[PDB]
Amino acid sequence: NDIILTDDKWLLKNPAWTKKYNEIEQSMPAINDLSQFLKEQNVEFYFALPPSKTNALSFKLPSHIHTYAQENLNYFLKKLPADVKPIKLMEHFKQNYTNEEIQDMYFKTDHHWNMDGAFLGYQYIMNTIGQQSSIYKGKEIAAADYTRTCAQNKHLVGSFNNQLYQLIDANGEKLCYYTPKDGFNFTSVTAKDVQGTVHQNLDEIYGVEAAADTTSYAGYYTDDYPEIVIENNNAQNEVRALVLKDSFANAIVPHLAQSFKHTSILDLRHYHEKDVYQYIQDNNINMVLFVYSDSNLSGDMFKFK
Ligand code: NA
């Protein structure tokens, strides 16, 4: 049972009205377990935390009411086993940018970060992994190796559960892509959707409705798939990554996949064929990377067994 806030026509989904320490406690054992298993199997374990829009833009909420996005996140980060390496995106963002600048990294009418936010996120994620990892060597992520292209007056349709929100606002907004100078050249791209249909090639899942004047985040970037598998033989490493994600990862699924030789991308809301432990063993995963919004700290996507 969600709640939506509107204000100067920005849309804010499920602000942190309450502490969720109790919900975090109840889900943390699954992580403790996974963490111990992965440490045994010599598999690196990163937990990237894109800033939820209601954290990054909590300054737009009524000033007479305190919200707890940062407390909840801090609680999660303190209860995390020390062998989980968190990537603290809100902290990085708030350290380098003002509130008004950070607002330019989110869509106004949809509750995800935009491509500029997601890219900066990608950059910090890979930079951190690069400093921590024994198996990941790669070129530092510079904006100069990508070409950024943008359309100016697109209209994002808010989508969450079975709900579509649309804002009549003649301006609309920025829709950007960051594309490698020589394109994404993946050896293969395979994605099973929720109906069981298998799609091949990046073009059938990423930016499929880019030309649309009005559509959802999912249409502009990707939908949520049970499983995407990407083989990248041109990668200068042997990393076989497993990305476990919520929809914040969609905009940067191919940018992440470019870093590693193999990338498996699961959404546990939809992937039910194997559990995570078995998937990791069946596919010789030597690196795990969560990409969960920092408000997605507990609940259904933390069921790994
Ligand atoms: Na600053």
Side-chain angles (χ1 to χ4, degrees), residues 93-98 101:
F93 282 15
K94 273 196 160 72
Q95 164 186 313
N96 291 273
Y97 305 99
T98 62
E101 290 169 339

mmCIF file of all heavy atoms in Angstrom, residues 93-98 101, ligand 1:
data_model
loop_
_atom_site.group_PDB
_atom_site.id
_atom_site.type_symbol
_atom_site.label_atom_id
_atom_site.label_comp_id
_atom_site.label_asym_id
_atom_site.label_seq_id
_atom_site.Cartn_x
_atom_site.Cartn_y
_atom_site.Cartn_z
ATOM 1 N N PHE A 93 27.432 11.229 -3.572
ATOM 2 C CA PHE A 93 26.685 12.318 -4.200
ATOM 3 C C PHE A 93 26.687 13.561 -3.288
ATOM 4 O O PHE A 93 27.064 14.659 -3.712
ATOM 5 C CB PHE A 93 25.225 11.905 -4.511
ATOM 6 C CG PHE A 93 25.044 11.014 -5.759
ATOM 7 C CD1 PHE A 93 26.106 10.371 -6.356
ATOM 8 C CD2 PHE A 93 23.776 10.819 -6.296
ATOM 9 C CE1 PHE A 93 25.917 9.551 -7.468
ATOM 10 C CE2 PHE A 93 23.575 10.010 -7.404
ATOM 11 C CZ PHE A 93 24.650 9.374 -8.001
ATOM 12 N N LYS A 94 26.279 13.378 -2.036
ATOM 13 C CA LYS A 94 26.134 14.503 -1.101
ATOM 14 C C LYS A 94 27.473 15.153 -0.766
ATOM 15 O O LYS A 94 27.527 16.313 -0.395
ATOM 16 C CB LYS A 94 25.450 14.051 0.184
ATOM 17 C CG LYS A 94 23.946 14.089 0.122
ATOM 18 C CD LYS A 94 23.375 14.017 1.541
ATOM 19 C CE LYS A 94 21.947 14.528 1.620
ATOM 20 N NZ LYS A 94 20.953 13.589 0.993
ATOM 21 N N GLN A 95 28.549 14.394 -0.906
ATOM 22 C CA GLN A 95 29.887 14.908 -0.681
ATOM 23 C C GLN A 95 30.358 15.843 -1.794
ATOM 24 O O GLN A 95 31.131 16.778 -1.552
ATOM 25 C CB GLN A 95 30.851 13.737 -0.544
ATOM 26 C CG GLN A 95 32.310 14.095 -0.689
ATOM 27 C CD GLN A 95 33.198 12.864 -0.693
ATOM 28 O OE1 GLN A 95 33.043 11.979 0.153
ATOM 29 N NE2 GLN A 95 34.127 12.795 -1.650
ATOM 30 N N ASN A 96 29.889 15.599 -3.015
ATOM 31 C CA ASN A 96 30.422 16.317 -4.170
ATOM 32 C C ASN A 96 29.450 17.287 -4.826
ATOM 33 O O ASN A 96 29.839 18.075 -5.674
ATOM 34 C CB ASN A 96 30.904 15.320 -5.220
ATOM 35 C CG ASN A 96 32.135 14.560 -4.781
ATOM 36 O OD1 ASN A 96 33.257 15.013 -4.978
ATOM 37 N ND2 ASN A 96 31.930 13.399 -4.182
ATOM 38 N N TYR A 97 28.189 17.237 -4.437
ATOM 39 C CA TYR A 97 27.189 18.018 -5.137
ATOM 40 C C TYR A 97 26.155 18.603 -4.212
ATOM 41 O O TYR A 97 25.854 18.031 -3.184
ATOM 42 C CB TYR A 97 26.483 17.152 -6.178
ATOM 43 C CG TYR A 97 27.413 16.489 -7.150
ATOM 44 C CD1 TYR A 97 27.784 15.169 -6.984
ATOM 45 C CD2 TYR A 97 27.904 17.176 -8.260
ATOM 46 C CE1 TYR A 97 28.618 14.543 -7.883
ATOM 47 C CE2 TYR A 97 28.747 16.563 -9.152
ATOM 48 C CZ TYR A 97 29.102 15.242 -8.960
ATOM 49 O OH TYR A 97 29.949 14.615 -9.843
ATOM 50 N N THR A 98 25.580 19.733 -4.602
ATOM 51 C CA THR A 98 24.510 20.328 -3.809
ATOM 52 C C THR A 98 23.183 19.626 -4.055
ATOM 53 O O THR A 98 23.044 18.815 -4.980
ATOM 54 C CB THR A 98 24.333 21.826 -4.119
ATOM 55 O OG1 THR A 98 23.955 21.981 -5.491
ATOM 56 C CG2 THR A 98 25.623 22.598 -3.854
ATOM 57 N N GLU A 101 21.920 20.431 -7.579
ATOM 58 C CA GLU A 101 22.628 19.634 -8.561
ATOM 59 C C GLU A 101 22.140 18.193 -8.582
ATOM 60 O O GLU A 101 21.942 17.608 -9.653
ATOM 61 C CB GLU A 101 24.127 19.694 -8.286
ATOM 62 C CG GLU A 101 24.696 21.061 -8.594
ATOM 63 C CD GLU A 101 26.109 21.259 -8.090
ATOM 64 O OE1 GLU A 101 26.535 20.521 -7.180
ATOM 65 O OE2 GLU A 101 26.801 22.151 -8.624
HETATM 66 NA NA NA B 1 30.075 20.066 -2.847
#
